[PDB]
Chains A and B, each alone.
Chain A
């Protein structure tokens, strides 16, 4: 699975000293592009993208997102009028991109949200814009009569994919690397309860399975994951806890399944 993802937010309330429009690009979860309404320029966010592109590329990308900023500026006015609202805290969100699956087949998305709730989604197959809400019906007729569906189908199926294949090749050293996590497991006692905590520090790539074992057997009872959260250096962290009976510290182990490990790693307190 390979993914190219463009996500952008137009805000009424960023707020103080922060940009109202922020647009960012993602290749396989990795941030490579940034645009904001203050700077008014599209900038690289990784070393692998900056080394493989000239300023002729970035000026061209700047012209596109500057247009996208002004469209989403007016969208804030339009949808507040659509919902009969004045001022306040409001957001327009866009999610655009394409997938190259393990199958070798291509998925494509271009969908929006108003105030964190699904507004419209483009159907690549039928070449129509789906309206998730009754207030999104006037958007549907405006968008389809604009005739954007023709070009957007071609972009998501061809142009987006061509760029993504090129980006995967540009940043192969970073995207294909394997980083082994330093794993620790800690025990703490609250009120009449032992809570055990497992932490995987600094792993890449993102996919990871972290399970608890009691006497060898896998336990999901009173287990909780904090998901996969990022570090500042492009590596990942994950935090998994389990509630247990007091005294049972030596019974528990933390099973880590990751690409950097040829066999699963077990860790104890």
Chain B
């Protein structure tokens, strides 16, 4: 059930 947007992990 992961979010499609893995860019939300950007630091």
Most buried by A among B3, B5, B7: B3
Would you give the 0/1 interface string for A141-153, flagging 1 where the beta carbon is closer than 8 Å to chain B?
Answer: 0110010100110
Q: Does the CB pair A68–B9 fall under 8 Å?
A: yes
What residue in chain A is nearest B11 (Cβ atoms)?
A75
Closest residue to A151 on the B side, CB-wise? B5
Main secondary structure of the interface of A (DSSP, over half): helix
Chain B residue at smallest Cβ distance from A23: B2
Contact partners of B2 in chain A: CB under 8 A: 6, 61, 64-65, 68
Which of B1, B6, B8, B9 has a CB less than 8 Å from the CB of A159?
B1
Q: State whether A152 touches B11 (Cβ < 8 A).
A: no
Interface size range on B against A: 10 to 19
Please report the C-alpha to C-alpha distance between residue A181 and residue B4 in the assembled complex, in whole angstroms. 41
B1 — which chain A residues lie within 8 A by C-beta? 4, 25, 159-160, 162-164, 166-167
The residue on B at minimum CB distance from A164 is: B1
Interface residues on A, range: 35 or more
Within 8 A of B (CB), among A74-113: 75, 78-79, 92, 94, 96, 110, 112
Query: Pick the contact of B8 from A114, A152, A164 — CB < 8 Å?
Result: A152
- Interface of B, secondary structure class, is loop
On whether A68 and B10 interact (CB within 8 A), knowing A4-B1, A160-B1, A163-B1, the answer reads no
Cβ-based interface call for A15 (8 A): no
Q: Are A142 and B10 in contact (CB under 8 A)?
A: yes
22 interchain pairs (CB within 8 A)?
Answer: A6-B2, A25-B1, A64-B3, A64-B6, A67-B6, A68-B2, A71-B6, A71-B9, A72-B9, A92-B11, A110-B8, A112-B9, A139-B10, A142-B10, A146-B10, A148-B5, A151-B4, A152-B8, A159-B3, A162-B1, A163-B1, A167-B1
Which residues of B approach A to under 8 Å, CB–CB?
1-11
Report A's interface with B, CB cutoff 8 A: 4, 6, 25, 61, 64-65, 67-68, 71-72, 75, 78-79, 92, 94, 96, 110, 112, 114, 119-120, 139, 142-143, 146, 148, 151-152, 155, 159-160, 162-164, 166-167
Given contacts A67-B6, A151-B4, 13 further A-B contacts (CB under 8 A): A65-B2, A68-B6, A71-B9, A71-B10, A75-B9, A75-B10, A142-B10, A146-B7, A148-B7, A148-B10, A155-B3, A159-B1, A166-B1
